[PDB]
Design a protein around this ligand. Structure first.
Ligand SMILES: NC(=[NH2+])NCCC[C@H](N)C(=O)O
Length: 267
């Protein structure tokens, strides 16, 4: 199928530094849940697939610049991001959590197990008041250009002393070095790291969903338009959603999630 054709090859951008979503093997080849899912979705469509590496900070500009056609990199679906790109339906959930080292004063919290910032209400606002007091006078680290940064900078938990790094591996090491007091990231990121490193990282407070954390992880695609590029982009959105539905019906997304996360993180 020639490039530009109705049914041509799809280039998918991923980071390669975010296990178990996307990572690199010892040979440096890209692996993980999203690599295997991308391949399965493109097989359903009957289109060829190429996976290419892209740094997280530059991921959305790179899509806009046409370095690739789709983002599959653990990217949460948010209304903010929908201002400039669009998403497929979600294929997996990712709850966020605060993490500290064993010994921290935050290990004595009593919050709900989870809160949803879109559903909101008085009990959620009270939990945020508690978190505001818990973070006062502490340093908190997170990955640059994430929902986690957005939340912390929002004022919803007060005026936070935020530290950021380009990659989640740096966040993990800032926390375990003791150089930062608290970190915010996906719960699955902290458990993947706790599992590999053996370091005593502990989740504290409620898990976070909704609001600045969005609603699941989806395929990021350029917004449709009327020029050649734009009608191809509209069709890619249509094809991805059909393929996700088919994969879900066949039990594929669930099976893959268990094979990577150890539990069914799929949507
Ligand atoms: N490849 C990565 N490092 N992704 C980080 C994603 C974190 C979060 N889900 C967000 O959309 O901001």
């Amino acid at each position: 199928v020639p490039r530009g054709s109705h049914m041509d090859k799809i280039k998918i951008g991923t980071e390669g530094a975010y296990p178990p979503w996307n990572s690199k093997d010892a040979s440096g080849a890209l692996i993980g849940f999203e690599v295997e899912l991308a391949e399965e979705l493109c097989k359903i469509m009957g289109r060829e697939c190429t996976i290419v590496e892209q740094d997280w900070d530059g991921m959305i500009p790179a899509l806009l610049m046409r370095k690739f056609d789709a983002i599959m990199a653990g990217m949460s679906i948010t209304a903010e991001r929908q201002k400039t790109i669009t998403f497929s339906q979600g294929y997996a959930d990712e709850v966020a959590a605060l993490a500290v080292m064993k010994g921290s004063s935050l290990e004595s919290m009593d919050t709900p197990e989870g809160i949803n910032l879109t559903l909101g209400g008085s009990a959620v606002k009270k939990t945020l008041k508690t978190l505001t007091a818990a973070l006062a006078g502490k340093t908190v680290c997170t990955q640059t250009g994430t929902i986690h940064q957005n939340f912390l900078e929002s004022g919803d938990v007060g005026k936070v002393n935020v530290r950021t790094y380009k990659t989640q591996d740096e966040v993990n090491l800032d926390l375990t070095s003791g150089r930062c007091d608290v970190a915010l990231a996906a719960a699955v990121a902290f458990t993947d790291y706790a599992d590999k490193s053996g370091k005593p990282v502990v989740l504290v407070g409620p898990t976070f969903s909704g609001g600045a954390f969005g609603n699941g992880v989806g395929v990021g695609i350029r917004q449709g338009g009327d020029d050649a590029i734009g009608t191809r982009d509209a069709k890619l959105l249509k094809d991805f959603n059909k393929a996700i539905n088919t994969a879900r019906k066949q039990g594929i997304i669930s099976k893959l999630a268990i094979k990577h996360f150890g539990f069914d993180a799929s949507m």
